[PDB]
Amino acid sequence: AIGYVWNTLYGWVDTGTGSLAAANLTARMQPISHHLAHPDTKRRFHELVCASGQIEHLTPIAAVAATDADILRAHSAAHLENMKRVSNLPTGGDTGDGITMMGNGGLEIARLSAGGAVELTRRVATGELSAGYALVNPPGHHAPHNAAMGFCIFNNTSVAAGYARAVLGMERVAILDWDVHHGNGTQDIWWNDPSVLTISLHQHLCFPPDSGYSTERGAGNGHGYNINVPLPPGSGNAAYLHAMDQVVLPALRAYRPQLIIVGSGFDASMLDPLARMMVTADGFRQMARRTIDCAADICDGRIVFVQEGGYSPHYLPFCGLAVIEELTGVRSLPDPYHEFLAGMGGNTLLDAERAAIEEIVPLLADI
C-alpha cells in the first residue's frame, strides 16, 4: 500500500520574476516567466502521476501543516521565529540568503511541505502504508538548524526524521539524499547525532560552494554518521549505481535504521540546467529499486521518499514517474526520451568516478 502526497499549494510557491536571484535592472537580468525553481516542474511530475494512471495504484495522503513542535525538532527557535517574521511581512521577503524567498503567508506552504513528509512518515511507520512518495515543495535539504537556504525554508526530511525519533520512538533513522547538490542543511542538523545517519551523493562543489567534502564526517557521538559522496561532473548511471552498491547500501546495512527517508531530487538528470550529471529515468529507477529492496531487507520495507530538487520541466516528470513505478510495481509507460539520452553516455564507470567512490569505502568501518 503506497502513499502519495500532493497539495495544490505546492504548485503555488511564488518564485518571482527572476531566474535565480530576482530580476534586476542595473545588472540587466531581464524578468522571465519561469524561474529556475518554478513550481511547474514538480506540478508536471504530479500531473504525470495522474495522467499515467499511477494515481490509481496509490493511496492519496493529505498533507498536514507541521506544527511549531514538529519544526523545532529539526530547527532552532530563532529560525522558526524568523520564518514567522518573514512570512508575516506585507510582501513577505528574503529568508536570509538574498535568494530564498517566502511571500506573505508562505509559511503555510512551508508547513504543508514539511508536514507532508511527516504525515507520510507517520502512516508508513504505523504500518498503514508500506512505503510512499511525498511530492512536496518547497524542498528541504539545504536548510540547516538555524537558517533557510537554497530554496529551502525547512528541512523536510529532518523534520520527518525528528518526528520518527521523538514521537514514534525510533532509535535510528537514515536520510539518503540523491538530489545532485550537497545536503548541507541535513548534515548540519544531525552533525553531533548518531541517531540519524545522513548520506549525501552530489556533484562535488555544485551547491553550496566549499561544502560536501568526504572529510565532513560529524562530530562527538555523531562522528562517522555523516557520509558525503562527492562525484565529478559528467557522472551518470554507472557512477550512481556504483556509489549505491559500494557505499550507500553497505552503509544502510551497517547502520540498521528503523526507517529510510530518501531526499529524492532529480537534478542529477541528463537534462537538468542546475547540474552537469547524466542520470536517466532508468538510472533513477534502479536507484529507487535498490533502496526499496534494501528497506525490505533491513527495516520491514519502511521507506519514505520526499521530493528535493530537479529543474527540467520536460524530463523530471519521467524521472519521478520511474520512481513511483518502482513503488507501485506497475510499469506502464515508456520514458519517451530513453533512446535520445541513452546515446549520450554516462553508462560506463569512468576511472575518475570509480576513484571518487573508492575514497569513501574506508569510512564504512566507522559505522
Ligand X SMILES: O=C(CCCCCCC(=O)Nc1ccccc1)NO
Supply angle C-alpha 263, 199, 229, rounded to 5.
110
Q: What x-and-dash track marks residues 180-219 binding K ion by CB under 5 A?
A: ---x------x--x--x-x-x-x-----------------
222 binds, among ligand X, Zn ion, K ion, none (CB under 5 to 8 A by kind): K ion
User: 97 among the known binding-site residues?
Assistant: no
- The verdict on 177 binding K ion (CB under 5 A) reads yes
- Cβ–Cβ < 8 Å for 221, 204: no
Measure the CA dihedral 152/154/158/162, to 10°.
Answer: 180
350 binds, among K ion, Zn ion, ligand X, none (CB under 5 to 8 A by kind): none
190 binds, among Zn ion, K ion, ligand X, none (CB under 5 to 8 A by kind): K ion
Running DSSP on this structure, what letter comes out for residue 277?
Answer: -
* 3-class state of residue 281 by DSSP: helix
Contact range with Zn ion by CB under 5 A, out of 79-87, 216-224, 302-310, 350-358: 302-310
98 binds, among ligand X, K ion, Zn ion, none (CB under 5 to 8 A by kind): ligand X
- Cα–Cα distances (Å) from 345 to 8, 173, 233, 322, 362, in that order, read 37, 35, 13, 19, 29
Amino acid in the structure at residue 188: D
Smallest separation, CB 102 to ligand X (Å): 14
- Cβ–Cβ < 8 Å for 81, 174: no
- Nearer to K ion among residue 85 and residue 223 (C-beta): 223
Smallest separation, CB 183 to ligand X (Å): 8
- Cβ–Cβ < 8 Å for 31, 145: no
- The verdict on 181 binding Zn ion (CB under 5 A) reads yes
Out of 207, 225, 240, 284, point to the residue binding K ion (CB under 5 A).
225
Tally of CA atoms within 13 A in the half-sphere of 356 that contains its CB: 25
- Nearer to ligand X among residue 283 and residue 309 (C-beta): 309
- The verdict on 151 binding K ion (CB under 5 A) reads no
- The verdict on 309 binding Zn ion (CB under 5 A) reads yes
* Residues lying near ligand X in the complex (CB under 6 A): 20, 97-99, 139, 141-142, 150-151, 179, 181, 207, 265, 267, 274, 308-309
Out of 179, 193, 216, 326, point to the residue binding Zn ion (CB under 5 A).
179
How is residue 230 written as a grid cell? Answer: 562527492
Smallest separation, CB 284 to K ion (Å): 13
How is residue 323 written as a grid cell? Answer: 520512481
- Nearer to K ion among residue 157 and residue 226 (C-beta): 226
Can you tell me the distance from the alpha carbon of 146 to that of 79, in angstroms, rounded to the nearest whole number?
A: 5
Can you tell me the distance from the alpha carbon of 72 to that of 79, in angstroms, rounded to the nearest whole number?
A: 9
How is residue 339 written as a grid cell? Answer: 533512446
Query: How long a stretch of residues is the chain?
Result: 367
Can you tell me the distance from the alpha carbon of 106 to that of 95, in angstroms, rounded to the nearest whole number?
A: 11
User: 267 among the known binding-site residues?
Assistant: yes
Can you tell me the distance from the alpha carbon of 363 to that of 119, in angstroms, rounded to the nearest whole number?
A: 33
- Nearer to Zn ion among residue 39 and residue 265 (C-beta): 265
Residues engaged in binding Zn ion (CB under 5 A): 179, 181, 265, 267, 309
The annotation places the binding site for Zn(2+) at 179, 181, 267
Residues engaged in binding K ion (CB under 5 A): 177, 179, 183, 190, 193, 196, 198, 200, 202, 222, 225-226
